[PDB]
């Protein structure tokens, strides 16, 4: 397991060693992504050696126990922690109320790291580390498998390549930008400021 794709393995082996880790116990580790693709971008990782290397699509289909445990952490145990993190990344003026509708949770259909990781992130996609269409698309299309996706609605592996070829479009308003990733980025910034302006008075 010496591929760079195995680099997450350190967080579940020795979570006590990394400042990036904001919660762990015997079962899971909540860690900040080192290349955040939104203002807040966290990963929830199982520490189970027999689950960490299972593909997320096989997890969704055949490991509901784990799915339910992860959800219980996100929506229960760690909810307050995640909202506080969001306030640190966005604005302290934001309520859990407003943040709840500004966060998404799910797996990549074709992860790039080998250890199972659930993405927990704000919707903005305003971040320096979002650098190409593939990044953006991987979070705003069916390639992002929302944790509440029914098994019957899981994406087909074969058809996954075609998503990354399509014009860029804003997730919030649907405006398209062709392949002008740079124009998309400027617009995402505009969308975030708008959401933030509306939301801080609430
Ligand atoms: Zn828009």
From Swiss-Prot:
Reaction catalysis annotation: a 5'-end adenosine-5'-diphospho-5'-2'-deoxyribonucleoside-DNA + H2O = a 5'-end 5'-phospho-2'-deoxyribonucleoside-DNA + AMP + 2 H(+); a 5'-end adenosine-5'-diphospho-5'-ribonucleoside-2'-deoxyribonucleotide-DNA + H2O = a 5'-end 5'-phospho-ribonucleoside-2'-deoxyribonucleotide-DNA + AMP + 2 H(+); a 3'-end 2'-deoxyribonucleotide-3'-diphospho-5'-guanosine-DNA + H2O = a 3'-end 2'-deoxyribonucleotide 3'-phosphate-DNA + GMP + 2 H(+)
GO molecular function: DNA 5'-adenosine monophosphate hydrolase activity; DNA-3'-diphospho-5'-guanosine diphosphatase; double-stranded DNA binding; double-stranded RNA binding; GMP binding; guanosine binding; mismatched DNA binding; single-strand break-containing DNA binding
EC class of the enzyme, as a word: hydrolase
Domain of life where this protein originates: Eukaryota
Annotated Pfam families: HIT (PF01230), zf-C2HE (PF16278)
Outcome recorded upon mutating residue 131 to A: Strongly decreases abolishes enzyme activity. Decreased affinity for DNA
Subcellular location: Nucleus; Cytoplasm
Annotated keywords: Cytoplasm, DNA damage, DNA repair, DNA-binding, Hydrolase, Metal-binding, Nucleus, Zinc
Binding of Zn(2+), residues: 170, 173, 187, 191
The UniProt record lists the keyword Plastid: no
Outcome of substituting residue 112 to A/E: Nearly abolishes enzyme activity. Mildly decreases affinity for DNA
Effect on the protein upon substituting residue 135 to E: Nearly abolishes enzyme activity. Strongly reduced affinity for DNA
Domain HIT: 8-130
Complex and partners: Monomer.
Function: DNA-binding protein involved in single-strand DNA break repair, double-strand DNA break repair and base excision repair. Resolves abortive DNA ligation intermediates formed either at base excision sites, or when DNA ligases attempt to repair non-ligatable breaks induced by reactive oxygen species. Catalyzes the release of adenylate groups covalently linked to 5'-phosphate termini, resulting in the production of 5'-phosphate termini that can be efficiently rejoined.
Protein name: Aprataxin-like protein
Gene for this chain: hnt3
């Amino acid at each position: 397991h010496m591929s760079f794709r195995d680099n997450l393995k350190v967080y579940i082996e020795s979570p006590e060693s990394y400042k990036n880790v904001i919660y762990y116990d015997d079962d899971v580790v909540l860690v900040r992504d080192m290349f955040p693709k939104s203002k807040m971008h966290l990963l929830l990782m199982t520490r189970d050696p027999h689950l960490t290397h299972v593909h997320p699509l096989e997890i969704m289909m055949k490991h509901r126990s784990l799915v339910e445990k992860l959800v219980s952490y996100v929506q229960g145990d760690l909810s307050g922690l995640i909202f506080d993190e969001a306030r640190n990344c966005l604005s302290q003026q934001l309520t859990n109320e407003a943040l709840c509708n500004y966060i998404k949770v799910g797996f990549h259909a074709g992860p790039s790291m080998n250890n199972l990781h659930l993405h927990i992130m704000t919707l903005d996609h305003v971040s320096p580390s979002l650098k190409n269409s593939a990044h953006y698309i991987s979070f705003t299309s069916p390639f992002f498998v929302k944790i509440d996706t029914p098994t019957s609605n899981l994406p087909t592996r074969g058809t996954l390549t075609s998503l990354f070829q399509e014009d860029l479009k804003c997730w919030r308003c649907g405006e398209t930008f062709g392949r002008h990733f740079t124009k998309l980025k400027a617009h995402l910034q505009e969308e975030y400021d708008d959401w933030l302006d509306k939301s801080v008075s609430m």
